[model samples]
Target: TRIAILGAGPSGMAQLRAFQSAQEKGAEIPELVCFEKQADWGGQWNYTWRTGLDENGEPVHSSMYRYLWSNGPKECLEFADYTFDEHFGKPIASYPPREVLWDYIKGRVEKAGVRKYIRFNTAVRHVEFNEDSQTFTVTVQDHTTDTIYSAAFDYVVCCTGHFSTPYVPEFEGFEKFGGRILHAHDFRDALEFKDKTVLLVGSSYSAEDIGSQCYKYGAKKLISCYRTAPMGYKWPENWDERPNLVRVDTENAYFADGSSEKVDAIILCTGYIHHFPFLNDDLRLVTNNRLWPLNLYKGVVWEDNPKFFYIGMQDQWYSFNMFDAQAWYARDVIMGRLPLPSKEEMKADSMAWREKELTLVTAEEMYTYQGDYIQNLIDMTDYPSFDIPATNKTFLEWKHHKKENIMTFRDHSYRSLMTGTMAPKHHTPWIDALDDSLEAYLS
Candidate 1:
């Protein structure tokens, strides 16, 4: 069977490795075509000095900004088959910067020899399902020749990530709001906001991380307004968490709490929109970012149509290895190794998870819900399984560390469940590490 994997990111890489794993064991792997819009791999990790659009006039796939580090512990997302010790050759810190993590991810797929299958600079246009023939016709724009081509595939796997399109919402008086206003996606350099009063909207990961970075780099005062509740970190004296943003004037921002701040810049840390412009509405998985999107059976297969699959689309907690589980499961189904249950059965399965997902209220419960989801996927595939219970414990400890001191959480380290090696704390504190180069980090 021929298959088309419509990305070369971490999820797409996992799919390629899954096929290779089968091929190495004397199984006939299907013909695979992996299309990559970016000129190189490492999807979001392929950070660019240029943004908005590349020379090809395509929207840049990378949303990575400068001086970004993993907000979570590395051990939580380490590949079970390829431990960090195997990749780094030694125990490194638990929280690595963007470049260091990118290199570590590349080390695995490079060993898998999957880069040969990728068509760089090829962007997918639309996927039209041929109901009569039971196949999909994928149209792609090849940037090299500026030519569009269509090909038929037995199955279509979408690994194009969720963070591509920036969701820019309009706020009152946004057009005239003086200094500078941008989304977290456009935030590249925190130093640009240094020595300025910055107002941030939203209190998710982006708000916390970006606000912290701004304060660390040199922002004078950071005021973050939240829609629901504050991130509630024991913030620095200069940082203030406020109620929702009511509106902004030319020189100041008015908050719902009857407060105003003379803000120099406003950043919308509001999350991304899930858009697959290529997929037909019938095949499109439309939902806000949630723990479990309803249609995907076992978080991989499209229950509406078994032949269609998606990877790494969930609001991730267990990221890389979770994608590995989904990819392996997708590979097995495409290879005719696993039979699809009746449509009603698949719906019932997903509904059960969605129901369970709704019951999650706290951080511990939320991550444990995700961990349980990942564990279920791992049980059905050949992907090496790690200690989900242990990882969950690490997450609790991580939450504890974050509570103790959000700014200095990275200064602490955790033991690798895969390698049984304790992570060495970084030589420099995260707040002070202005030079985010991989070489500087390793040295």
Candidate 2:
């Protein structure tokens, strides 16, 4: 049997690693073909200067911005089998920059020798199921050869993540705004906003991180407004959090609280939409970003059709390790070692998880819920198990550190659960360490 994996991102890489691990154990594995639209892998971890459309005219898959560091502790997302200590040869700081994290992500796959299985610069156009043949037809565009081709596979895993397509909502007077208007997806360099007054919409991770980037890069003023509630962070001087943006025209922005700010630019830190235009409606996953999106049995196999699978499609609190568990579990299902239940039984099992997911209230409880989900997948598969409670504790500590000082959170470090080694503090503090290159970080 042949397996077609789409998008050579973290999820795809995890899928490749999962199968390779089984093969190394003297298990026979199916033919693996991974298609990546970009010229390289690493998915969101792969940083690119080009925004909107890439050279291939495809919407840029990575939303990584310049000078962006790890928003959370690396200990929380450390791989079970591949630790940071294993990759870096020693304990580094808890929070690393984008390039450092990208290098760590590449280390594992490079060591596993699975890069040969991937087909780079190839985009999957459409995926259709053949009912009678019980197989899938994958149509793809090979940018290198400038050719479109079709192939058949027994199983197709959709690892194309949900962070690509942006969810941009229009505000009043946005059409004729005087300054530049762009989504967080297109935000490349924070230096572009230096010495400029910026108005940001939305109060989630994007707004928080991007606003912090502006402040760090010497923006004149920072005004962030939210629809539901403010980020509630103790922002630095000149960084104001308002109720909501009422409208914007020419040089001024009207807020819901009878306030206005003359801003040079407006950035919609809105977030992303889960858009899979390649898959047919019957196979597409349509849900808001949540802990559990239903219709997938065990969060990997499609309930209606067991041959189709997805990885890393959840609202992530645990990223790389969670994908590893899902990937390993998916491999078992595809290989027939783990037999799938009936369609009705599959729907019932997923519904139970979704039911539990909705009951989560607090931040600690939310991460714990996802940790429980990942632990369940790990229990069913051969993925090496780690301390979930310890990871959750690290997440709690990270939250407290952020609350203590959003700007100084990276100064704190945490011990890695994988290696039992305490992470050393960075040479320079986050605010003062402007050079985000890996060489400078190691120095």
Candidate 3:
């Protein structure tokens, strides 16, 4: 039997490591093939200076901007199979820059001996499920060779992340606005906006983090507008959070509160869309970013069709290790060690999760809901189990830390649940550090 894993990043690497772990334990596995669009692994972690389309006219996959640091604690995202201590040889800070976390993700699977499964520069153009034969036909374009190939697999796991495609909403009078207008995905360096008044649109994580990023880089002023509630962080004197944007002119942003701000640049720190243009409608998983997306039995199995699976598809609170849980569970089901329930049973199970998901009213409750979801998947698989509740507790503490001071949250460190050791503070303060190079961070 052949299994196809799409996107050789964190989620795909986790799936490969899961099967490799089973292989080491003497379990016979299927022929595993992983497709990666980029030249190497670390999907979004692979940084490129070139934006818009890649060399092949494909849309660029990495949205990581320069000087980007982890907005959340790394203790919450530690892999159960690989601790931060094992990867770094000691405890690093609770929050690392993009490259640091990417290296740690590569460290485990690199040692796990799973990179052989990946096909670099190969993109899945279309994935269609054959109901009659109970197999999936995948069309892949190998950019390196300029060849199109078709293959069939007994199981297909989609690890392509949802952060690539941007969801840009246009504002009235945008046609006349002169300054740079770009989405968060296209944002690269903050120094490019130096001495300019930047207006960010959205109150989500992107707005919160990117706004702070600009402030650190010496943006003249910040005007961020939210759709509903304000971010409520004790922003700096140069920063201001207004209500939803009503419209925009050449040099001004009109807000829902009837306030107007003269801005030099508009950066729509709006979120991304869950886009899977390659998949046929029948094989596609369509849902907004939410804690619980329907049709996924246990948030891993494709209920409408059991032969397919998706990883890292949910709006996340947990990161790398959460993907490990789903990947291992998927491997078991495909290897015959685990069995799939009836379609009815799958839908019923998912509804149960969604039912609880709908009742979550607080941010703490949302993380707990996702943590419980991860816990349920862990019990059935041989994937190493860590304290998810501890991680959730860390998340609560992280929230409190951010509330206490958003700008200095990264300055504080937390104890790792996996290694039982406290994280050492970073060498440089986030605000003072303008260089995001891995060398600078490790120094």
Per-candidate Cα lDDT values, in order, are 0.89, 0.91, 0.89
What is the lDDT for 117 in model 1?
89
Backbone clashes in model 3:
0
On lDDT, the candidate that comes out on top is 2
Q: Give the lDDT of residue 56 in candidate 3.
A: 82
Candidate 2, 290: how far from true, in Å?
A: 0.9
Instruction: Please write out the lDDT profile of model 2 over residues 221-284, one tens digit for every residue.
Output: 9999989977988999899999988888888999889987789998999889889989888799
lDDT of each residue in 312-402, candidate 1, tens digit only: 9999888988889999999989988888999999999999999899899998999998999989888888887789999999999999999
Across 167-210, the per-residue lDDT of candidate 3 in tens digits comes to 99999988989888999999998889888899999998989888
Roughly what TM-score does model 2 have, to 2 decimal places?
A: 0.99
Tell me the TM-score of model 1. 0.98
The worst-scoring run of ten residues by lDDT in candidate 3 lies at 86-95
Segments in model 3 whose C-alpha atoms lie over 4 Å from true places: none
Q: Relative to the unseen true structure, what is the C-alpha lDDT of residue 340 in candidate 1, on a scale of 0 to 100?
A: 90
